């Protein structure tokens, strides 16, 4: 291998490369490695952790009160409570989720999400809610009896205080699902009990989430 | 998978500082010292401030040229003042000869010089967030065990040359291991080295008209 | 339902004064009235004990220190009370000022054993957003299901041993997400209690 001719691409500096270089301090023995607890080796394991969605993001509502969905008493049946698209990586309620931020450090992604809801009312307060999910094809349903014929989960928060709505698939390559919360029943309370509670939604990504083509963000 | 890992998330060497060897006009320095700083640009800062403790060695490349993109034969010296060595103070200074400060002698008209700085820190890993005071207001949260050194760059000359040399330091993070993930910074960066934000809070999520509109 | 932070019980660094159940007791700090207007509280990790009992003698009269903790929050709330807390332990919780003066006061970075009420809990007083605070070890306190939260925290730091009066490892934040509510004729201030129990503590460099 004594005679060589330089093929093209010489004297070039390609940033995204895994070349080698001489150590500027040979012999140096860096500080050894002790076991520090809590190492994360993948941003996927950070996405799969549930964080809050600013579902109440609205003009005027400031402070922590943007993370709360108001569920009150005099909201008649079949009325609409809240709705938010399933798009972790478009400006909306997902923009405050660990998934909604990491997905802005990449270009394409595809997987299954989940939206755990949590009721924060009195123990004596009972009722029922309808939580319906609409595939990307259709649009937001107009009535409660129009969303019951979908992929929903009726929620009796008096009995069970937290549910999960697993999104089947959400892929971003080139028109996104919608989740609506309908007042199934009324909001019934015994005497001497507050008549206005809150729902807290938490978003995440299931174990099938993937990311591709890392890129800078738009803050 | 394998593209969302922490080893790949910090790859793709980027510009960490544009230093300039001012040598003409009213700035007849002939040299310049650039304190090695990772959190120089907000884009890289916000990414590095995702973890608490991180351990990595770096490879530094210097893309130097004149101010009209021409690369003459002018010789350059890249001296790496280690963390705890006195820095030079003039074009002609004793520090430029100390054999403990490794130097790289390359010319403007040569492939950019590329060295590899090791993991230079007293503790086990770098600490971007250090709750506490060092030296057992202007000292809160300032860890001194994150200094990596200094890169002093001068044109090997005798008198003033009359040509400003712009250098673009490029750093690549290798062998990175991160610990204790943190929420990504939401507010702006009002000042460097501190987490100081501004009074007018900016909501993380954009505000729409009503809660029930898509 | 004890959230073992990062899945690591605090352990003794293999082979320093290793105290026992005399110091490994249950320090029950003062209670804090949780009101509707309440924003939150936070206590530093070893600073909350540097002036409380034996642990205040072993910390000040020494030079090196390492220990886990067993933070345990309870809310003596009624059944007609509603609300929700977010009890999270934040490793290397660094407080930030808020310029319209540039550096945090010392009372805000080492509040003592009383904690400092948040001035902007939406941003955790540290720039980072509260919505993502759940990435830290945490446990919800939802008055309709349970009013207890126990967090087991190991020793998280770069060096094996470190100072106890200068470097405060983490900070236990307690933030009400859903504010407290009640009809007329109830205890207008739900009390919040915090219990601490150093686990596998060590010390060195006497006096």
């Amino acid at each position: 291998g004594f005679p060589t001719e330089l093929k093209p691409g010489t004297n070039q500096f390609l940033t995204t490369d895994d070349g080698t270089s001489p150590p500027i301090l040979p012999g140096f023995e860096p500080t050894p490695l002790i076991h520090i607890p809590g190492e994360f080796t993948s941003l996927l394991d950070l996405c799969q952790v549930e964080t809050i969605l600013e579902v109440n993001n609205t003009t005027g509502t400031t402070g922590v009160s943007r993370l709360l969905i108001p569920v009150r008493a005099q909201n008649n049946v079949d009325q609409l409570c809240a709705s938010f698209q399933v798009d972790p990586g478009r400006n909306g309620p997902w923009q405050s989720t660990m998934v909604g931020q990491i997905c802005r450090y990449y270009t394409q992604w595809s997987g299954s999400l989940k939206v755990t809801f949590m009721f924060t009312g009195s123990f004596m307060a009972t009722g029922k809610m309808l939580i319906a999910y609409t595939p990307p094809g259709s649009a937001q349903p107009t009535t409660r009896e129009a969303a019951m014929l979908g992929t929903h989960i009726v929620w009796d928060f008096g009995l069970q205080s937290s549910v999960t709505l697993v999104i089947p698939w959400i892929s971003n390559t080139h028109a996104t699902g919608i989740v609506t919360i309908w007042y199934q029943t009324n909001f019934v309370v015994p005497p001497d009990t507050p008549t206005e509670a809150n729902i807290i939604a938490l978003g995440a990504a299931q174990k099938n989430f993937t990311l591709k083509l890392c890129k800078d963000t738009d803050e | 998978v394998n593209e969302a890992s922490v080893e790949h998330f910090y790859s793709r060497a980027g510009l960490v500082g544009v230093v300039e060897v001012k040598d003409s006009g009213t700035s007849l320095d002939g040299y310049t010292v650039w304190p090695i700083d990772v959190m120089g640009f907000v884009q890289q800062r916000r990414k590095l401030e995702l973890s608490t403790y991180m351990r990595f060695d770096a490879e530094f490349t210097f893309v130097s040229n004149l101010n009209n993109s021409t690369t003459p034969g002018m010789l350059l010296q890249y001296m790496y003042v280690p963390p705890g060595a006195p820095k030079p103070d003039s074009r002609k200074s004793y520090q430029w000869q100390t054999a403990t400060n490794p130097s790289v002698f390359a010319k403007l008209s040569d492939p950019p010089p590329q060295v590899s700085v090791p993991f230079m820190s007293p503790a086990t890993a770098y600490q971007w967030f250090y709750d506490g005071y060092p030296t057992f207001n202007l000292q809160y949260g300032q860890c001194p065990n994150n200094m990596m050194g200094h890169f002093a760059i001068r044109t090997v000359s005798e008198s003033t040359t009359g040509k400003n040399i712009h250098v673009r330091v490029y750093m690549r993070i290798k062998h990175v291991r991160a610990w204790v993930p943190r929420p990504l910074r939401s507010q702006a960066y009002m000042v460097k080295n501190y987490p100081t934000y501004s009074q007018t809070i900016t909501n993380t999520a954009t505000d729409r008209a009503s809660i029930t509109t898509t | 339902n004890i959230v073992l932070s990062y899945g690591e019980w605090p352990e003794y660094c293999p082979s320093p004064t290793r105290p026992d159940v005399s110091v490994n007791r249950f320090y029950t700090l003062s209670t804090k009235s949780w009101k509707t207007e309440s924003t939150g509280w936070y206590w530093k990790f070893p600073d909350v004990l540097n002036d409380t009992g034996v642990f205040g003698q072993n910390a000040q009269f020494h030079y090196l220190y390492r220990s886990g903790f067993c933070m345990h929050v309870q809310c003596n709330a009624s059944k007609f009370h509603q609300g929700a807390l977010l009890v999270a332990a934040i490793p290397e919780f660094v407080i930030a000022a808020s310029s319209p003066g540039l550096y945090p006061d010392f009372a805000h970075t080492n509040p003592g054993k009383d904690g400092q009420e948040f001035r902007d809990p939406y941003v955790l007083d540290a720039g980072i957003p509260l919505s993502q605070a759940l990435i830290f070890p945490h446990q919800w306190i939802n008055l309709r299901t349970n009013n207890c939260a126990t967090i087991i925290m190991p020793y998280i730091n770069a060096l094996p041993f470190d100072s106890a009066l200068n470097h405060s490892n983490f900070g236990l934040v307690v933030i009400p997400i859903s504010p407290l509510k009640y009809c007329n004729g109830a205890t207008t201030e739900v009390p919040i209690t915090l219990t601490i129990a150093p686990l596998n503590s060590e010390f060195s460099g006497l006096r």
Partner: antibody, heavy 120, light 106 residues
Framework: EVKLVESGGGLVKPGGSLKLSCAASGFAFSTYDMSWVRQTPEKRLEWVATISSGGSYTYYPDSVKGRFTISRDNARNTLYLQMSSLRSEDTALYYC?????????????????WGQGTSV | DIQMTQSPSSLSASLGERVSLTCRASQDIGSRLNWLQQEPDGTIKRLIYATSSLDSGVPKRFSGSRSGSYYSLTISSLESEDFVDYYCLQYAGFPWTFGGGTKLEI
């Protein structure tokens, strides 16, 4: 019912002090964030001052911003509002009602029930 | 302040007519605009909250609506006990300003 009643007003020389009471009952006056609204002689209701749900926070509009001093007894079920050195064009029927930018679970009772309004 | 103001300073309709009082906001105030009804001499009651929902006791003749920057209130058929003052209040702009008046006549 949310029974609020304002009282303690009347004439006063320009420059001095004249408090105002909004003692209310029939509802939990320990969780609601109240506020003060002024109805000038021109029949234009302008915001006067507010108070948090525990008497710790306060937003003062450009009307006083340093002159009026609101408070909250919260134990005798009363609401205070100072008129320190009131201006010349400051006569109004100072109403008091609920509603406040604090109390995160707000934006629902924003001046839901009102008082009666005492003149000055 | 956002300075949401009502256009009709004074209107007059019949006992079977359908009045339409507006309140044109300047900046983005969202769905945080209320309507406060004031007696000739008494206190000021509430009609609409969040621009759409009636209160717990208000009749069916009243109803709110939203249209861009033209938040408005429309009474069904203008029954008795209606020829009183009207106000529009928003709590988005932190100064919390008000409008003018819509004292109805006949």
């Amino acid at each position: 019912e949310v029974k609020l009643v304002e009282s303690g007003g009347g004439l006063v020389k320009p420059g001095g002090s004249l408090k105002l009471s909004c003692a209310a009952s029939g509802f939990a006056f320990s969780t609601y964030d109240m506020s003060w609204v002024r109805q000038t002689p021109e029949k234009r209701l302008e915001w006067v001052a507010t108070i948090s749900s525990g008497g710790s926070y306060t937003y003062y509009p450009d009307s006083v911003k340093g002159r009026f001093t609101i408070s909250r007894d919260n134990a005798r079920n009363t609401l205070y509002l100072q008129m320190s050195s009131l201006r010349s064009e400051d006569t109004a029927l100072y109403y008091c009602a609920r509603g406040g930018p604090y109390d995160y679970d707000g934006s629902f009772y924003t001046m839901d029930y009102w008082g009666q309004g005492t003149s000055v | 302040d956002i300075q949401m103001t009502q256009s009709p300073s004074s209107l007059s309709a019949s006992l079977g007519e359908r009045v339409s009082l507006t309140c044109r906001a300047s900046q983005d105030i969202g769905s945080r605009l209320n309507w406060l009804q004031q007696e000739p001499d008494g206190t000021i009651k509430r009609l609409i909250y969040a621009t759409s929902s009636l209160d717990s006791g208000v009749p069916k003749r009243f109803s709110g609506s939203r249209s861009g920057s033209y938040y408005s209130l429309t009474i069904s058929s203008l029954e008795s006990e209606d020829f009183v003052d009207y106000y529009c209040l928003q709590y988005a702009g932190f100064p919390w300003t008000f409008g003018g008046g819509t004292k109805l006549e006949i």
